[PDB]
Amino acid sequence: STGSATTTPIDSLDDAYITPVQIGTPAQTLNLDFDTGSSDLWVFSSETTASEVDGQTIYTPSKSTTAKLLSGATWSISYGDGSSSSGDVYTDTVSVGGLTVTGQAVESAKKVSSSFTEDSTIDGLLGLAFSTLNTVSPTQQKTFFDNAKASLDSPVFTADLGYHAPGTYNFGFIDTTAYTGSITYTAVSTKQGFWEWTSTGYAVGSGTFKSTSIDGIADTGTTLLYLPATVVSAYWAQVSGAKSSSSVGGYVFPCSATLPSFTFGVGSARIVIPGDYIDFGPISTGSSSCFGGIQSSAGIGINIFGDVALKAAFVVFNGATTPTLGFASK
């Protein structure tokens, strides 16, 4: 089997992407944030504290003839950005772009933190990291991809995120028309539960490539590119007037600037992030100070190849017995 679904930016900045997901019978379609940095499929629901729901579409398990309470199971998750959610668990039928999994754990939120409430466009998350990170207790549950894998034509999914435009998540096949040149594959460590890999270096603008190993995670659920402070300083030094602002929370730059591109290495291959992808706009409405899309990972504890990086590539998440990651230009 295969599936193919369009993923759509939630706003004009590509702060996140939502993908429609069918849950239950009859289908209830919710727009979920596909997140290769976590491993829980959780949704706003009829069980979510009413004051914490503000415009989201909810899953109502009592209206699904295939929903079953997973007795005794609870979940609770905290994300790198400080947000969180928790609740109980149902199993139900879940379909993405024509690919159906029966008996998928659907984690129903009883509580969500303010950042979720305040984002009316995201109805929940669909985790695509390794199932070892799944938070369901006392019986850990499998991700949608893990459940689908054996039925797929090939045990892979691909992320093709758009810049200021829709893109695509495919399951079970590689669309050879969706990228240019060849796909370069690189090793993955699953030791921390992430799609963790090592970039071979970077360049700023038209500058020379610096060969250096940068360990990090491919994370569709993180907006920006978080890299070591040395790398980030080298990038922003090429933007007149750019500076790190402790008050704002990262590097800012004059909105009048033209940003240089940023290149990262994948083996001997190179992925070029255009300068415009690194612009996250005014820090507040009407400001001439703009927020940068490349930020320091210092104090996160891990480097994160988030959407800023991934949207410059066609990315293969290869879930074969020994997982690997593939990157192509597009």
Curated annotation (Swiss-Prot):
Its EC number is 3.4.23.22. It is an enzyme of class 3 (hydrolase). It catalyses: Hydrolysis of proteins with specificity similar to that of pepsin A, prefers hydrophobic residues at P1 and P1', but does not cleave 14-Ala-|-Leu-15 in the B chain of insulin or Z-Glu-Tyr. Clots milk. GO terms for biological process: proteolysis. Disulfide bonds join C255-C290. GO terms for molecular function: aspartic-type endopeptidase activity. Residues 17-328 form the Peptidase A1 domain. Keywords: Aspartyl protease, Disulfide bond, Hydrolase, Protease, Signal, Zymogen. The active site is at D35, S199. Belongs to the peptidase A1 family. This is Endothiapepsin. It comes from Cryphonectria parasitica (Chestnut blight fungus). The chain holds residues 90 to 419 of 419 of the full protein.
